UniProtKB/Swiss-Prot annotation, chain A:
Gene that this sequence comes from: ycf2-A
Species name: Arabidopsis thaliana (Mouse-ear cress)
Protein name according to UniProt: Protein Ycf2
Similarity comment: family membership: Belongs to the Ycf2 family.
Described function: Probable ATPase of unknown function. Its presence in a non-photosynthetic plant (Epifagus virginiana) and experiments in tobacco indicate that it has an essential function which is probably not related to photosynthesis.
Portion of the full-length sequence here: 1983 to 2034 of 2294
Subcellular compartments: Plastid, Chloroplast stroma
Swiss-Prot record, chain B:
Residues involved in Zn(2+) binding: 1, 5
Family: In the N-terminal section; belongs to the AAA ATPase family. In the C-terminal section; belongs to the peptidase M41 family.
Location of this chain's protein in the cell: Plastid, Chloroplast thylakoid membrane
Lineage: Eukaryota, Viridiplantae, Streptophyta, Embryophyta, Tracheophyta
Name of this protein: ATP-dependent zinc metalloprotease FTSH 12, chloroplastic
Coiled-coil blocks: none
Functional note: Probable ATP-dependent zinc metallopeptidase.
Induction: By high light.
UniProtKB/Swiss-Prot annotation, chains D, H:
SUBUNIT field: Homodimer.
Sequence positions that bind substrate: 81, 87, 119, 153
Expression (tissue specificity): Expressed in rosette leaves. Expressed in meristematic regions of roots and shoots, cotyledons, young leaves, trichomes, stamen, pollen, tapetum, gynoecium and ovules.
Protein name: Malate dehydrogenase, chloroplastic
Family statement drawn from the similarity comment of this UniProt entry: Belongs to the LDH/MDH superfamily. MDH type 1 family.
Annotated active site: 177
GO molecular function, one term: chloroplast protein-transporting ATPase activity
Function: Catalyzes a reversible NAD-dependent dehydrogenase reaction involved in central metabolism and redox homeostasis between organelle compartments. Plays a key role in the metabolism of dark chloroplasts and non-green plastids. Essential for embryo viability. Plays an essential role in heterotrophic metabolism in embryos, and autotrophic metabolism in photosynthetic tissues as well.
Substrates-to-products reaction catalysed: (S)-malate + NAD(+) = oxaloacetate + NADH + H(+)
Keyword Chloroplast set for record: yes
Swiss-Prot record, chain F:
Complexes and interactors: Homooligomer. Interacts with FtsHi2.
Tissues/organs with expression: Ubiquitous but preferentially expressed in young leaves.
Disruption phenotype: Embryo defective. Impaired plastid biogenesis and thylakoid differentiation in embryo. Defects in the photosystem II protein complex formation.
Residues of the full protein shown: 806 to 855 of 855
Taxonomy, superkingdom: Eukaryota
Function: Functions in chloroplast biogenesis and chloroplast division. Required for plastid development during embryogenesis. Might be involved in chaperone functions or play a structural role in the thylakoid FtsH complex.
Compartments where found: Plastid, Chloroplast thylakoid membrane
Family in the record: Belongs to the AAA ATPase family.
Name of this protein: Probable inactive ATP-dependent zinc metalloprotease FTSHI 4, chloroplastic
Organism: Arabidopsis thaliana
Length: 36, 48, 48, 317, 53, 50, 52, 317
């Protein structure tokens, strides 16, 4: 579809996005082998 | 303006219910339609 | 009024994608996710 | 802010190579030079709105003024394949051209990066080494053999077969740059993918005979002139990055190294400001039986090629 | 006390009784929950899994 | 593009190992989960006296 | 903000690995979705049973 | 992720233009086409480790399969300059070739961007317009004339003269792409720099005669083959960015515009998703008396060229 069947702005996807963003920020701010 | 709104509302298989449409409501130089979304969309709790 | 006018009907936009409740079948994928990573940056300029 | 001199920039490979060198953010001045038809190439490249200056020199008379302040010497001069003519006469003409060019470089600029392109480079890099030795200015750390075409072809074939992303794929290649001597290290390919035996066999023969495939696909119209320019431009930009002081200039070149009994060998090297800084020692061990027997097969042919080159470079005048 | 008694006791504390019950009319958020639960099961072996409905 | 490869091909092997380990444990524990034969109290633990 | 193009590609590789892992074990989620459509409520013991 | 088809990618301009198109980060499929010697070009370009795939089609029989799903059509076809050959026979050969190619693209893919490179493009764009009109598929917003080379030459000469840093220097160019009709707008050059009278005179004559300087510098070896490929690649990249949805795609092209009485005129345009979106109307107001009488002088010459083009394009078969 032309993206016609997505489920924008509902419950758990926002929490998942916030959790991933927070995890990424925590990982990046504390970098001061695992990572290339 | 109102006729175009009504036409593009009623050109669709599953748009909201068109209650009515009034030109110059109470002397104001404007116009208004009333559309009531279907109950399934309310029960869904999200938008597509 | 448009019942006997036969307008050009729009396609349905909000028809729900649904799974058969008990039809045992491997429903397919394309084979991927559709997300594209955000990487837009021009090449560095000359005289370096 | 470096200076690059292409020796033979009016032939087949020379014009696209100059076109690619001009448009790089590292080159600022460039001497085109060939025995003929170098005025038009410089006139054509003088209109592009890139700040890399273009000057050109015609004939051996101005070759003395061509190699002043030069940091990188590019030598793509050499006649392409012609009808009715064999390996021996091409060896002689290309060898004579590279003798004159490296002798001009040794007379003018001993301290410039030397890139030898003319074919066969397996027996041509030793010629350049010998004619640099004869003047007492031989620097083994500043003389390379452009062998990036095998790496590019290996990456292309591997990413086409295994269906991987083309930028991420890089395949180590050792040996030389003539047919059988090119051994791709398919067991050391990143990203990690498992290969079969038939796939490795077909990839190896395709990599070894891709140049033959192109020269028969052209129906005798010459050799590879766009992929050769691509690989030469990649190696030139890598060498220019090495001159910048960049600490991860890793390439695959045919240089005088002591990994095996052969004096010259193509492998992964790490280039620095002064030229060769290290040679990657992780490539020659860890091989399977396939790469082992392929290496011991190509060793004698590479030795014969290097002996032919060093013997032809030492003939009396 | 068997497994079922503990499960029914846990279900009666972290679930809210509700009238005018309606289910999901678009299958496709079901796959989201299924994938997240499978990933949380196999990968993070020290975290709970809330029931899917 | 400016983006070269990221975290590894080695920690992907680590998470694949974790996935495979948990998958085999689940597969094993879904077949041999119940084998109970008897539970007799040892109210005559003889090593204490005899 | 020179730190916006790094998280995106990391999530991209995470999505690629998740896609590659889900594609091979697609039958597991397919039968499991059929089960969830069949019986309305679902627990982790049913996870471990239906992993086959 | 777009498809580009080069019609005539085995001539002088074609091979460097195809090589530059291959290195673009937006091309995903490339359809080479020429009457002969296109297998070798595809063999050369099939080994580069770039994810843009390369396919070639030989002969007008397979030209029908060349134009499937093509978004951008590039036409650099046309024989270079030959000794003893006058203007009219050259115009006949190039015009017949472009007429057959425009008939082919009209038959196969009428919703693709059309770029005309064959010289003179002043009398060739009307030929393509009339041929597209004859099939009822003409779109005036999706047919361009490549005159970018004049802009590049103007920028290079102005940055060389005024000692400005060449990256920011852009000079508007109006008229056409043949000699006197090219008028650089030196009074609207950014960055803002004050010019004298004789400097403007010599810069204008140098910009107008840089083409003939190129062709006499080569001593009859052809025309510009690296700068023309540069300008064509720049315009192709800009058109591909226009298809990508960028809202700041501004170029200088020879298109059908009504800013003057002339149907076709080279000026600054803004390209969108559906082709031409806007025409910069402010280029012709604000000129001094020099540019005013230059436009008055070039109008009749451009009108004659366009009339000759339309006259040839409607000749009976």
């Amino acid at each position: 579809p032309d993206e016609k069947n997505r489920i924008t702005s509902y419950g758990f996807v926002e929490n998942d996005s916030d959790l991933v963003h927070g995890l990424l920020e925590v990982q990046g701010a504390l970098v001061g082998t695992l990572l290339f | 303006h109102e006729a175009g709104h009504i036409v593009l509302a009623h050109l669709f298989p599953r748009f909201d219910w068109h209650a009515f449409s009034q030109l110059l409501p109470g002397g104001k130089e404007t116009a208004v339609s009333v559309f009531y979304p279907r109950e399934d969309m309310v029960d869904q709790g999200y938008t597509t | 009024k448009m019942k006997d006018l036969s307008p050009l009907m729009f396609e349905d936009f909000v028809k729900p994608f649904q799974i058969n409740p008990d039809d045992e079948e491997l429903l397919p994928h394309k084979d991927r996710v559709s997300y594209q990573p955000v990487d837009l940056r021009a090449a560095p300029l000359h005289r370096s | 802010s470096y200076k690059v001199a292409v020796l033979g920039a009016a032939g087949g490979i020379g014009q696209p190579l100059s076109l690619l060198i001009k448009m790089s953010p590292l080159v600022s001045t460039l001497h085109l030079y060939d025995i003929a038809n170098v005025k038009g190439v410089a006139a054509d490249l003088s209109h592009c709105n890139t700040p890399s200056q273009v000057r050109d020199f015609t004939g051996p008379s101005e070759l003395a003024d061509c190699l002043k302040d030069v940091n990188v010497v590019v030598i793509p001069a050499g006649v392409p394949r012609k009808p009715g003519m064999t390996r021996d006469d091409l060896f002689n003409i290309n060898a004579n051209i590279v003798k004159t060019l490296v002798e001009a470089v040794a007379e003018n600029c001993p301290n410039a990066f030397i890139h030898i392109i003319s074919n066969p480079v397996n027996s041509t890099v030793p010629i350049a080494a010998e004619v640099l030795k004869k003047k007492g200015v031989y620097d083994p750390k500043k003389l390379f053999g452009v062998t990036t075409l095998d790496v590019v072809r290996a990456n292309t074939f591997v990413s086409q077969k295994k269906n991987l992303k083309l930028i991420d794929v890089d395949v180590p290649v050792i040996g030389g740059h003539a047919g059988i001597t090119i051994l791709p290290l398919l067991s050391k390919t990143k990203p990690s993918v498992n290969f079969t035996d038939e796939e490795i066999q077909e990839l190896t023969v395709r990599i070894q005979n891709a140049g033959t495939e192109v020269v028969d696909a052209k129906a005798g119209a010459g050799s590879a002139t766009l992929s050769m320019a691509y690989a030469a431009a990649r190696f030139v930009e890598s060498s220019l990055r090495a001159l910048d002081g960049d600490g991860d200039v890793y390439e695959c070149s045919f240089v005088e190294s002591t990994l095996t009994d052969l004096p010259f060998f193509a492998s992964r090297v790490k280039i620095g400001k002064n030229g060769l800084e290290a040679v990657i020692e992780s490539d020659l061990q860890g091989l399977t039986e396939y790469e082992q027997k392929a290496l011991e097969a190509l060793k004698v042919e590479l030795k014969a090629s290097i002996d032919k080159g060093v013997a032809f470079a030492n003939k009396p005048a | 006390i068997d497994t079922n008694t503990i499960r029914s006791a846990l279900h009666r504390q972290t679930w809210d009784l509700r009238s005018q019950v309606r289910s999901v009319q678009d299958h496709g958020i079901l796959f989201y929950q299924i994938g997240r639960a499978v990933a949380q099961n196999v990968l993070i072996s020290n975290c709970p899994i809330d029931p899917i409905s | 593009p400016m983006e070269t490869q990221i975290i590894s091909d080695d920690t992907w092997k680590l998470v694949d190992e974790i996935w495979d380990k948990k998958v085999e444990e689940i597969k094993a524990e879904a077949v041999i989960q119940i084998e109970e034969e008897k539970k007799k109290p040892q109210i005559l633990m003889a090593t204490h006296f005899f | 903000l020179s730190n916006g193009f790094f998280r995106s590609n990391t999530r991209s590789e995470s999505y690629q690995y998740l896609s590659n892992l889900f594609i091979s074990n697609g039958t597991l989620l397919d039968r499991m979705t059929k089960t969830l459509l069949k019986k309305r409520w679902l627990f982790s013991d049913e996870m471990k049973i239906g992993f086959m």
